[PDB]
Design a binder for this molecule. Sequence first.
Ligand SMILES: [Zn+2]
Ligand SMILES: [Zn+2]
Length: 348
Amino acid sequence: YRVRKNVLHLTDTEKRDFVRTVLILKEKGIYDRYIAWHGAAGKFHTPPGSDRNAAHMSSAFLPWHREYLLRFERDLQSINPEVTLPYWDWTTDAQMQDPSQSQIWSADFMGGNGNPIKDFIVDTGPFAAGRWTTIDEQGNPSGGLKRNFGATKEAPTLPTRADVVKALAITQYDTPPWDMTSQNSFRNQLEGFINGPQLHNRVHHWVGGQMGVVPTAPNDPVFFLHHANVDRIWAVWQIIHRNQNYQPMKNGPFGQNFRDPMYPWNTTPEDVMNHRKLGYVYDIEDRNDINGPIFVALYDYEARTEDDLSFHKGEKFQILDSSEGDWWAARSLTTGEIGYIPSNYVAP
Ligand SMILES: [Zn+2]
Ligand SMILES: [Zn+2]
């Protein structure tokens, strides 16, 4: 119903409107509730003593951020109902010689890199020091968004589409012991602890500044755009593994199970499992995404890997990735299932 668009597809006036709505949220005092919630969650351990918390390093990571974004989008809309939360596809940016040159970091959107001369404070765009006040872990105004693109050793680059495919392939939502150690965990892989930092965590440390330190990261509006991407990735995974569901269903830590409340709210994973049902959809879920159907199966095809589709002579397809050249990511118009088909089997 409400459509979350890729930052690349936003109109100038869309971008201006998102920025303005955020500045209003900041002025009204609403925005700072989201910083506080995020910090509170991060220090609420499940159970006390573990390094699992309500929002990170555990199974709730995904449903938690979904609910936070849904909440934030609603606040946005209460200001200007036309506004939805866009998403930052960093895998597209990763394709550039210099991802810093992404239009996302323009003075009309998120503004630029930290200024080394000025101690890495941001001095372009609407969130530059002097237009936007930040707070520390304690709540004490620390005045000034900072960023430092790609500066750290562990995270010089943004994750790639291949990095995302690797993750979209994992069959299990999450696995014991439901934390940063989890293996064959779509959730832990997306969070980015498997050979970390990857994907979600990598983006954090790539941006640097407040974004590089989880308790302060929402001081940067881009945190929302980043997380919209993460949620989008999760939604695709849900469409793909439509047979799979969230785990743990039971007997995980309290706060982590399908039906536990996620501190700091009464929202359960279950409550936010079906995003469509929460009133919003990603743009790649309508019609004519980034291309047209190179569809029509020329011949019957039987799958020869786990990530391939089977199909009959006749099935039309919505092609979704072009990268590999020979095997391209598609979606069946009959079955609505998603996986790989070989190019040479379909003609437009
Ligand atoms: Zn977080
Ligand atoms: Zn995050």
